[PDB]
Structures are given as structure tokens and as C-alpha cells.
Design a protein around this ligand. Sequence first.
Ligand SMILES: Nc1ncnc2c1ncn2[C@@H]1O[C@H](COP(=O)(O)OP(=O)(O)OP(O)(O)=S)[C@@H](O)[C@H]1O
Ligand SMILES: Nc1ncnc2c1ncn2[C@@H]1O[C@H](COP(=O)(O)OP(=O)(O)OP(O)(O)=S)[C@@H](O)[C@H]1O
Ligand SMILES: [Mg+2]
Ligand SMILES: [Mg+2]
Lengths: 451, 451
Amino acid sequence: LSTAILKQKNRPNRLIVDEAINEDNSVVSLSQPKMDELQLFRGDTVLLKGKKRREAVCIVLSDDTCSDEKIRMNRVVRNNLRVRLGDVISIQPCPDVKYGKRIHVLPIDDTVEGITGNLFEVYLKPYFLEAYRPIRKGDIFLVRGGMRAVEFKVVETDPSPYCIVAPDTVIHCEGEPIKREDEEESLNEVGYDDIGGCRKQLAQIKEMVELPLRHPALFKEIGVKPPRGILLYGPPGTGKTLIARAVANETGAFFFLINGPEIMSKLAGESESNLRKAFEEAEKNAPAIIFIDELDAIAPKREKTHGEVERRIVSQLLTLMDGLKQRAHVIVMAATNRPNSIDPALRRFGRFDREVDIGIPDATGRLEILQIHTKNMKLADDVDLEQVANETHGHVGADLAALCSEAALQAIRKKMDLIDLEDETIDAEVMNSLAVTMDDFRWALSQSNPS
Amino acid sequence: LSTAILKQKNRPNRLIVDEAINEDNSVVSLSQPKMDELQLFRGDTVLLKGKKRREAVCIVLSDDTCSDEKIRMNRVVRNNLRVRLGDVISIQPCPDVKYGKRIHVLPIDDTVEGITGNLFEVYLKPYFLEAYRPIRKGDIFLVRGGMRAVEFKVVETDPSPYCIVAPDTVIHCEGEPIKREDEEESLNEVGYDDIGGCRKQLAQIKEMVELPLRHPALFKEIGVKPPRGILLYGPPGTGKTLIARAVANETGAFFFLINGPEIMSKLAGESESNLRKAFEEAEKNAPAIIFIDELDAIAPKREKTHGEVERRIVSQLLTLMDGLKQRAHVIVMAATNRPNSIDPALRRFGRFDREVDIGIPDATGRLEILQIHTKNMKLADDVDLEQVANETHGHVGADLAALCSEAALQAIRKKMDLIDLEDETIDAEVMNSLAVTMDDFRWALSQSNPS
Ligand SMILES: Nc1ncnc2c1ncn2[C@@H]1O[C@H](COP(=O)(O)OP(=O)(O)OP(O)(O)=S)[C@@H](O)[C@H]1O
Ligand SMILES: Nc1ncnc2c1ncn2[C@@H]1O[C@H](COP(=O)(O)OP(=O)(O)OP(O)(O)=S)[C@@H](O)[C@H]1O
Ligand SMILES: [Mg+2]
Ligand SMILES: [Mg+2]
């Protein structure tokens, strides 16, 4: 009703992700009745939009066994789009794709332990030979070559970001293997889905940041100026910084992050350069979102603040906030857990003149969060999160995370007589037996604390 | 029950140290019934793990008189392993030992006062001749040669850290004699055993620091992220720094120490370099433990702190704490006796978000400590520590240490009419007569003070 901006719409080309029949990386299945509706001929190269602004490039074919409003893609494709089976994507005609000049691709470290021989010969040459594949920068794809299957990451393409791999395409694969861990972190980067119990506020954010930038005309037409300063506040630990993350990954804009405590670590005047440098960068690449985390760290009350360089920064900032031209297309977001200590001049109209309170979560919010956290944890069947939710009154996001971490330990703890700290490696059986029992939670619960 | 991680396990090759029958440095006794269980043939060269990460290398033989789950070793071996008779060790097959290229060994100063003649000839040559001994770097071993017995320290081996001494091995013993005192300090280096009345906390430390680093997979498997900031706090003098010591010596990890008061003694900016330098060192050598002693000295409340360079450091640190990547494998530990004066931003989730309170010890704790202290003191038989323990209410670790030091003096005091300060040397008889009577304690006790 007021959460309207969130419920996404039934549209011609929003299709649910079904498991693939055809097993090929560059292939996507569609019902014939659909392919026509979207004016899509066979072997056409298409563009796919996923989550967290991830993109994939594929070739399209008709599947008899595929529902109209469903689409098949393998796990490699589900990965680049960052979607689980049952999620929904945008399909779009990608007609002007150019042939590939040169591509640079590296293998993942934990998929090459063993023989080198020749990676191009054994793996890449055949996978690409006479295939004419579409690929995007930052695609991770798997190639089987006789005895092994190896994962490769598309480091660079000419032309960026996408090209077709033709016979003329020079393929470079020399370099240091990509580290798995980094690419683990990359998958794990926070989306909107990863924040819980903030629907109301999430709405406002999109309404004040995402919307004014994606569709500036709605405001033009109606004849009003969008606000340009948004200040999130909340009792400590409520996913303010966490939202900072989501937006960066999720937003269509050029994003620049500023960390109060990090600014203030610089030499006198070194900070003023960085402060300008940020605002200049943002203008140069507009539309942009500048985000200031822990604002209070750089904007105490000038009157009540002791150091001299210290006031200069509040002044320095104020100036920049004000120095933003209308045509600039920059929204400054920021966040504190102590709003009242921030110099009031910054909350004057035309500066940070919009607030999003990010309060304690209620019963269902806790349940939401608990779900988001445990989504990759090993839990016993006897674990009831609704219970936890109810028993966790006054917890916030960070309190809950802690709770989970604690029970997890307690679980690990129950294996601690079976294991000695000294051992070089752990008995592989027990490892698999390990799970967080509901009892583990009740222990963690018995230990919990105020926010 | 929650101290589970501490109780060590019955295992195939955890054997109790029994006094040796065979008197040789390179020899270890085992029951035949055991030797088989561990697939260990006679004259095999084995690896032995002691306390505080000490290691010894020996040759193994069967003893008829030796219990299955016991092992015999002489005092020289008990010394390199840093164990008293009745302690327990790891025995491990050491199969790939290489022959010794060159070894450098020096004698101990207070074991060579007198004739030189030739140390190699009289002592080393025979002890090694046709023996094929296993030795480790940092072994101290004793050699008898006619009239005298001399102690040698293995300064360097090629290949490090262990090699077999064959006839081909070139032996260098030229140099300045090792100073006894240094090697006294070395034996005395604080282990875990040296801290008393903290079992509960000692547990949490291992649980939070040693465990996440030694076995990162338990958390991976269960799908939780270990915490990376641990803050120890306690009323002054409760072995916070003392634990700092233990961990350094005891840990598997690369360890880097930071002393608040020592950081703050540096020129402006000269501290910031060191702070980074430390965090960089730790990343470079991960897995690592960075330890910050007297944290409050560098992290007062930014709001409540006066100097400018002074806030810059709190900011500087915060940044680094945050700048720690997931893949980094670094746990930051720190300690204060004034937790409440530390800037709260540092106790936010994902920074120092775990506390270990190191509190006053109870009756038995005191008794524990009193034992640990007096372990190398000359005490009369009439001395009842249980008494002391009961009478010392409200004392902490440092209070007790003081007490002992005070009674010791009182004891020395009782010899003070027999002795004049002026004398060049002390009557050697009285020296031996000296011991701390229980009365001495009752005096010290009568003088004691609040913490
Ligand atoms: N609303 C939420 N949904 C899901 N997880 C959350 C939420 N809030 C906090 N968390 C978890 O707790 C961690 C800390 O949250 P942050 O966003 O750093 O808190 P914060 O509100 O920025 O705290 P301050 O004000 O800087 S002390 C996050 O990394 C999440 O894992
Ligand atoms: N738990 C303990 N077990 C054994 N000895 C202790 C213990 N606590 C203190 N001591 C002795 O007292 C000395 C001082 O202890 P420290 O570890 O320096 O105290 P601390 O807790 O670091 O004090 P602060 O907070 O820096 S004033 C140590 O060197 C020990 O000899
Ligand atoms: Mg934050
Ligand atoms: Mg101390």
C-alpha cells in the first residue's frame, strides 16, 4: 500500500529461472510461444540482468519442455547472474555486439593445483573453437578438458564489456591465478535482499536516491526539485553501514564512499583534499551517490568542538554540500548513531534535510534477519527461528548476528573433546556431522546482552 | 562443560614422562606393546613435542621395564622439551631427516671457567664419533669429558632445524660462550601453565584466537565468521600482560606486540607509521595475532581527548581494524584495566566486539597462583599455602607476587646480623641454610595491601 515501490511487476520479459536441459554455458532455453512475443529469433545473442546489477550474455534457443514465463540456464549462468533457481530476470535483445579483438582470462587457483601442460590448448582452444561465444567482463565459466574441469574468470575484454569470441580473437591467459577467496567475497557482497526488517526505510531510500537519479523527469514534469542530502540514523548496529554496502552494489549510479574515521586519520589538509577530491570525482562521473559513513566523526558541533583543523572540515564540507549545482545529479547520503551531536547547520534545508530513522526491529524483523544470517549455516531440523525471534526482544541486527556466531561456537564446542587443538588436520567425518542444534541456540540465548 | 577445549584427550601417542633408565641424551624408552601400536621400529629417529612449542629429536628403543602409556627420557631431554616428570608429550615419526652438512655449537659460560685445551677434541669429537645423533637447533645438551661435564647449545644447523650428525658433518664451536643468564630467562619464558585462576578465560582465548587460526574450516563448514577483535579487561594487575606473554610464546601464529605507552612516546606521525607497519607486518605473515597492551593509552574517547595528533591515532587505528579483509586471518587482541574510557567506536560490532573479563581470583585461584610463584623458591616444610590462600582475600596475581617477594626479604632479613652489607662475598653455608619459613609469610601477610 505504501510498500508499493517494492512489489515488482508482471512484465513481458520477466522470466523465472528454471534448471537447464541443454547443458552449455552460452545457452538459454525459452518457450517458442514466448520467443515470438519478444521478437526473438533462434541463435540471437541476448542480454540478461540479474541481481546486484549483475549481467550475463548468452545465445537463445527454443525449448519444447520450457514454460512460457520460465527460462532455463545452467549453474554457471545462474552464478554470473547471482540468482538461485526460482528467481526472476530481465531478458533483452543485444543486437549490436561486436566481434572480439582480444581477451584476457585467468584460471582460479584451487582449480589448477597439478599439471599446467598448456591451459589454452587443453581447455580454452577447444571450448572456443568455431563457437562464436558471447562473453562479458567478469564472467566466471567452467571448462572440462579430459581429466579435469577448470574455472576461468574473464579479466579483460576488447571491446569492454562484451564481445563475441570469433576465430580472429587473440586469447591471452598468462598471469597469476585468481584467488578463490576473493571471488568468494565477490559472490557474498551484500544485496538489498541481505538486509532485514527495513522494508519501510528501504522504500524511502529508493524513493529519494535511486528514483531521482533513474527517472529525473518525473520531478521535472511535476515541477519539484528532489532532495540531495539523506541522513540515516539509528541506535548502534542497525545495518546503516550494511545499507551503505547494498546501495553501492545495487545502485545504477557511480558510487563514492567516505569513512569519517578514515578521513580524520589523514594529515591536516590531507583530509580537505580528499573531501574535495570525492565531491569532484562524483560530479565528474554523475549521476552519483556520495556516501559518508560515521558522519558524526567529521561533523561535530563546530561550537562544541575543540581542534582548529577540526572546525575547518565542518566548514569545508558545508561549502561542498552547498556548492552542488542543480544540474549535478549527485545525492549525498550519510549515517550516524548519534544524530544529535552533528552540527545543525548540516541539517538545514538543502543540505541533509531528509532523515531515515533505522530503528530497532520488531518481532518479524528479527525473524527476517535470523533467516538472512542462517541462510548459509548448518542447522539441525529441530531449530525453530520463530522461537528465537520471539525470545530476542530488544536485539538488533548486530545482536542477532552475534547470537548466531555464539551458538555456532557452542556447536563447535560440543565436538571439542573429540578434537584436540594440536592436530594437524580434523577427522573428516566429524566435520560433516557438525550442525547448530536448537539447544546450541538456547545456550547462546542464555548469554545474550543489551544493544 | 564449557571448559571442554582445555581437557586434553587420551590419544595413541600422548605418553607420560617417566625417568630414564638408559642415560643417553639421544635416547627415549618405550614399551614394546606401544612401539608396535605406533608402527615404530627400533633405532628409528622420532620427533617429540613438549610445552611452549618446544621440540626434541631422538632415537627410539624398547624398554621392558617401561609402561605402555609412559616414556623415558633423561633430564637433558626433559629440559629441551620444557617438561617436568609426570607431564605428557607427543611422539611422532620423523622419517625424512637429512644428514648434517655443518653445525655451529657454543658452550655455556659458567661451564667452561678453567682449561680450554680443545673443546672439540676432549668433548664434542667423542660424544659424536660414529654416533649418528639427531639434534635440533636450540638444543642444550651435556657432555662429560674426563674431569668435567660441559653444556653446549646448538646455535645453528645446516639443514635447519634438524639434521643427523654423521662423520661427514663439519663441526664449528668457535665463538663467545653463551651466557647462562640468557638461557635461564629462556627456560623461564611464560607458558600457559604459568597463569593461575583463569581456566574459564584461558578457555575463551584459545576458543577465540588459537582455534579460529589453527582450524579455520570448522567455521567455514558451519558457515560462520570468527570474531577478529578480543578485548581483555580487569582490575589492575590480573595477568592481562601476563597472558599477552604466554600467548606469544605458546601460539602457533606470527605474533606482533604493540605497547600503548610505547606507541605514544613516538614523535607525531612516527606512531602512525608504526601502527600501519604493525598491521602490514601481520598481514604479510598471516595467520597472525596483533596484541595491543594498555589499549586505553592510545584509544581514549575521541570526544573527551584533548590533543590533535591524539585523535588522529584513534581514527588511524579504527581505519586499520576496519581495513582487515576477510581472507586476512588476523585476530587483534588487546587489554586495559580501564575499559570504560576507551572510545566506544572501537567496541562496535566487527571491531573489539568480544570481551574477556579477567577478574579478581577466588580462594582456589590464589592457591593456584601461590603455587606457580613458589615453584622455584626455597620454602620450609612448615609452609602451608592453603592457609595463605584463605588469608589473602581480595588479592590479585600481582598482590600475591608482592607478598612472596616480601616474605623472601623477611627471610633474607633474618640472616642480616650474620651478614654485613660490606663483605665482598657471602658465607657459603648460610646461603644454603636460607629458606622462607611460614613465619616469614605471616609477616608479609601482616603488611599486605588493597589491589
Ligand atoms: N537490518 C539488518 N539486516 C541484516 N543484518 C544486519 C542488520 N543490521 C545489522 N546487521 C548485521 O550486523 C552487522 C553490523 O551492521 P552495521 O551496518 O555495521 O551496523 P551500523 O548500523 O552501521 O552500526 P554503527 O552505527 O556504525 S555502531 C552487519 O554486517 C550485519 O551482518
Ligand atoms: N593470573 C596470574 N597468575 C600468575 N601470576 C600473575 C597473575 N596475575 C598477575 N600475576 C603476577 O603479577 C605480575 C603483573 O601482572 P600483569 O600481567 O603485568 O598485570 P596486568 O593485568 O597487565 O596489570 P595492568 O592492568 O597492566 S596495571 C605478573 O608478572 C605475574 O608475575
Ligand atoms: Mg556503521
Ligand atoms: Mg599490563
